[PDB]
């Protein structure tokens, strides 16, 4: 029954003839029980991913890769599936690889495909797996790990794309137990220009887009608050250069974090003394960094 497809992928299929075979495969997956999916198992899943990477390598047939994504969604739509997608090496990585501004629909299907893994309860820290894998692609071609998620938040993009961006961002924020983490990557985002564009993502009136912001803003705010609660204390104690150096030496000294901090400081200390508006100047950077860590 199932074997018929496993061979079809291995039998060196190609543009157009592949597409067809892939379509039928999806539809067969969806319109079947759970036990028929098992028989496709790891072996079948395997071959699907092989074609993906092989198809990525090459540089008419975006439609060809897309169907393998849809196949996966269909395949993963159950216990067995996702689990066995998770056991793979390049599984989660290739889903990520499918994201991009150039093929709106594929990214759409790739994003929510990952998002549903994040908010998975029992395989703890799935958001960590996703974020790791998200990183690994940013070197093959050497651009930043988030620029996909921001590319699909411009002028031109399908308003359905935008929902799937911020939709992923939430799944890559909510289950994260460490507050430091969430503000970290949220600041990563806004460094690329999320705050420059997030203005426009309220101007658009939508039903499914604004159940997203109503969980994002809910977070970006319940973090900001809780963070002051910690900063406010630091406004009290670290009142003193002494209190600063005291902490700098104890925590930012013999931890790889040092040469970074050292640099930050070196940059800060650049504006020579006798600059009349130096108070004003440092005031300016004050708000810069403050916007960066808080807003």
């Amino acid at each position: 029954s199932a074997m018929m497809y496993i061979q079809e992928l291995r039998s060196g299929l190609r543009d157009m003839h592949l597409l067809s075979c892939l379509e039928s495969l999806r539809v067969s997956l969806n319109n079947n029980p759970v036990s028929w999916v098992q028989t496709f198992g790891a072996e079948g899943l395997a071959s699907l991913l092989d074609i993906l990477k092989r198809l990525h390598d090459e540089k008419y047939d975006s439609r060809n890769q897309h169907e393998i994504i849809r196949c996966l969604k269909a395949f993963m739509n159950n216990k067995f599936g996702i689990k066995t997608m998770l056991e793979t090496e390049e599984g989660i990585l290739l889903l990520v690889r499918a994201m991009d501004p150039a093929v709106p629909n594929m990214m759409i299907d790739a994003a929510k495909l990952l998002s549903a893994l994040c908010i998975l309860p029992q395989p703890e820290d799935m958001n960590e797996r996703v974020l790791e894998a998200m990183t690994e692609r940013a070197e093959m071609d050497e651009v930043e790990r988030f620029q996909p998620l921001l590319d699909g938040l411009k002028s031109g993009t399908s308003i359905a794309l935008k929902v799937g961006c911020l939709q992923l961002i939430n799944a890559l924020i909510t289950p994260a137990e460490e507050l430091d983490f969430r503000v970290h990557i949220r600041s990563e985002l806004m460094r690329l220009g999320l705050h420059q564009v997030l203005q426009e993502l309220r101007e658009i009136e939508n039903e499914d887009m604004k159940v997203q912001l109503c969980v994002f803003d809910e977070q970006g705010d319940e973090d900001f608050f809780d963070l002051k609660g910690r900063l406010d204390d630091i406004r009290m104690e670290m009142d003193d250069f002494g209190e600063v150096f005291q902490i700098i030496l104890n925590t930012v000294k013999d931890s790889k974090a040092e040469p970074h901090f050292l640099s930050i400081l070196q940059h800060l200390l650049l504006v020579r003394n006798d600059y009349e508006a130096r108070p004003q100047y440092y005031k300016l950077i004050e708000e810069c960094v403050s916007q960066i860590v808080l807003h």
Binding site: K73, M76, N78, I82, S115, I119, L120, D208, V215
Partner: peptide, 16 residues
């Protein structure tokens, strides 16, 4: 059919 339940409860997200 499972990951659909996780998908709708995503746009209309009560899985938070």
């Amino acid at each position: 059919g499972v990951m659909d339940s996780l998908l709708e409860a995503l746009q209309s997200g009560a899985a938070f």
